[PDB]
């Protein structure tokens, strides 16, 4: 079967690892041990077709900025995440997209813009802002709450669809 290498980029603190976890792990188990094999693979059925998701999550390693190109290059699709209560992370998106466009050496790279809700703080980025940014890039916009598992599958599955139709 087919395997999709999906990469989650975006400033630190936006909840990238929480998304990845929410998608891959078993939410019905008391203990989770990321230091155990294939805690990055997941077999799923999308639009009938059965594929294998390989998520490349580097949360925590944001500071190793020069290792970024290497990490990205193998990705086939990208989730550009940002926090709805963090305007900075939102304004960071533009450069993340440009970095991906450069390393993949292409102008048509499959990606999705993801606005994640980390806590209960005051939202500072309204979805309209995001919708418009997402539209200017010609890409899908999905809001999530990895904390309540809302929109997570939707964000990844949408990215996979983007890859299948590229």
């Amino acid at each position: 079967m087919t395997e999709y290498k999906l990469v989650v980029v975006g400033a630190g603190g936006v909840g990238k690892s929480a998304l990845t976890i929410q998608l891959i792990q078993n939410h019905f188990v008391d203990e989770y041990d990321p230091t155990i094999e294939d805690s990055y693979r997941k077999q799923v059925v999308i639009d009938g077709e059965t594929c294998l998701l390989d998520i490349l999550d580097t949360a925590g390693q944001e500071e190793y900025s020069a290792m970024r190109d290497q990490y990205m290059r193998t990705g086939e699709g990208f989730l550009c995440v940002f926090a709805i209560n963090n305007t900075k992370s939102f304004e960071d998106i533009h450069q993340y997209r440009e970095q991906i466009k450069r390393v993949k050496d292409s102008d048509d790279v499959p990606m999705v813009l993801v606005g994640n809700k980390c806590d209960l703080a005051a939202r500072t980025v309204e979805s309209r802002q995001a919708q418009d940014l997402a539209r200017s890039y010609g890409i899908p916009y999905i809001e999530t709450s990895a904390k309540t598992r809302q929109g997570v599958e939707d964000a990844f599955y949408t990215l996979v669809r983007e890859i299948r139709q590229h």
Binding site: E31, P34, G60, E62, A66, M67, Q70, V103
Partner: protein, 469 residues
């Protein structure tokens, strides 16, 4: 059996129940429990677990404050002695001295081990987590008062010991080696002439050695307090994770410097020499087990500006392409090879910290802080044993020192490396990329030529060490 004190005068006596302590499915392993139950196990009288002490002293701040931890262990230490048994009462009532076989058994099997383990937790607390005390002066006064109220001929040994360690920490590590460190190697640049130092003028063997010493010290300097609670990712990271961020920054500046040295060498023949030298440094890094160093090189070769230089890499000898490839393979499939490699080498080594940060974070974001049972909220200690398992692994590789002699000037040269200059990340990153487009244009743009820039021989002296000294 053995009678414990009344649970009404000594809380640490309340019996274990599914509502205050959960065990993991050969000492017992705690899955969860109340702070009280956790402290009881932290200082149990049956078995011992130096491993629990570290886990606890490293992670308790999220579920219990320092001042509270101290109050609790002081209460734990304050064990009430049992009442004379019937046999004793009989003797006393007859004017004879009681045998007190129960009181003695209780002192020998419960009080002694508990009080001693409490003192042990205090010794370790003060000895390796002294920051709790530097940030809270009163906490330290209480510790001192406490340690000073401990009466006893037996306890004396340890009381004195802990008092000295406490004073030694308020006021203000030599290494002996098996064999002797190899002779420092020189190339074109000579000792004292720090003005000539550069990537090609210094001996590649020495560049790998000195950077390995720098990188090792940076590695051995990261304390667990900079990792727990994912503080290196919060906005106060500069305050809580200074050592970590300093080390990550060095890695970045070095990767960037490698990239700069490559793309700013416009002449193809010279750039090939430059790339070869860097791959040779990679080779020595692998030899020295400096994985952090190997990845800095792999990262540079894979960055956008360098990765696309086909004309350059076409002229690299096979032996080197293979070395670079195997090195690159370490990070593939989620660092599978690297993890295997690291588990098999004979340290000293300098691991890649990236892996640990990612695991610690996923562990903190994928496990609840508490587990509810019958309404009661227990401390999810298994989450803590998992974070401590990672900080422990990190610490295990921090003990073994490298038997290499420091060369003050080369060390200094590398400490002051500043590829970016006054520019910002984006501006500099773009600069490097444009340079890459200049020296090797995108097809079908023709490949231009450029004048050489080095006035000295480009031949590498090789990475095999010499004997004389």
């Amino acid at each position: 059996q053995m009678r414990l004190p009344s649970a009404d005068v000594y809380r640490f006596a309340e019996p274990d129940s599914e509502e205050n302590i959960i065990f993991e499915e050969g000492i017992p392993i705690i899955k969860a429990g109340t702070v009280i139950k956790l402290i009881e196990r932290l200082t149990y009288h049956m078995y011992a677990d130096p491993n629990f002490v570290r886990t606890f002293l490293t992670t308790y701040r999220s579920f219990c404050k320092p001042q509270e931890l101290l109050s609790l262990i002081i209460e734990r230490f304050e064990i009430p002695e049992p009442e004379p048994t019937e046999a004793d009462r009989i003797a006393i009532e007859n004017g004879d001295q009681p045998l007190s076989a129960e009181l003695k058994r209780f002192r020998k099997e419960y009080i002694q081990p508990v009080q001693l383990r409490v003192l042990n937790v205090c010794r370790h607390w003060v000895e390796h987590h002294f920051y709790d005390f530097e940030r809270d002066a009163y906490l330290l006064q209480r510790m001192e008062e406490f340690i000073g109220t401990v009466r006893g001929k037996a306890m004396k040994k340890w009381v004195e010991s802990i008092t000295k360690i406490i004073q030694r920490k308020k006021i203000a590590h030599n290494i002996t080696f098996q064999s002797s460190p190899p002779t420092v190697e020189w190339h074109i640049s000579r000792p004292g002439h720090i003005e000539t130092f550069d990537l090609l003028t210094l001996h590649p063997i020495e560049i790998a050695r000195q950077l390995t010493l720098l990188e090792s010290d940076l590695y051995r300097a990261v304390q667990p307090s900079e990792l727990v609670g994912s503080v290196w990712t919060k906005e106060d990271k500069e305050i809580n994770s200074p050592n970590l961020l300093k080390m990550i920054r060095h890695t970045t500046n070095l990767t960037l410097w490698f990239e700069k040295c490559i793309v700013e060498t416009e002449n193809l023949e010279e750039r090939v020499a430059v790339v070869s030298r860097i791959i040779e440094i990679l080779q020595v890094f692998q030899e020295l087990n400096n994985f952090n160093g190997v990845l800095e090189v792999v990262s540079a070769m894979n960055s956008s500006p360098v990765y696309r230089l086909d004309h350059t890499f076409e002229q690299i000898p096979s032996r080197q392409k293979k070395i670079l490839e195997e090195a690159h393979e370490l990070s593939e499939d989620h660092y599978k090879k690297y993890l295997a490699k690291l588990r098999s080498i004979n340290p000293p080594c300098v691991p890649f910290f990236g892996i640990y940060l990612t695991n610690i974070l996923k562990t903190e974001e994928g496990n609840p802080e508490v587990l509810k049972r019958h309404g009661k909220e227990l401390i999810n200690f298994s989450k803590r044993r998992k974070v401590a398992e990672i900080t422990g692994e990190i610490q295990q590789y921090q003990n073994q020192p490298y038997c290499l002699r420091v060369e003050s000037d080369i060390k200094r040269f590398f400490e002051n490396l500043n590829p970016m200059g006054n520019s910002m990340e984006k501006e500099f990153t773009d600069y490097l990329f444009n340079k890459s487009l200049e020296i090797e244009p995108r097809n079908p743009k023709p490949l231009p030529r450029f004048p050489k820039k080095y006035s000295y021989p480009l031949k590498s002296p090789g990475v095999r060490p010499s004997n004389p000294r």
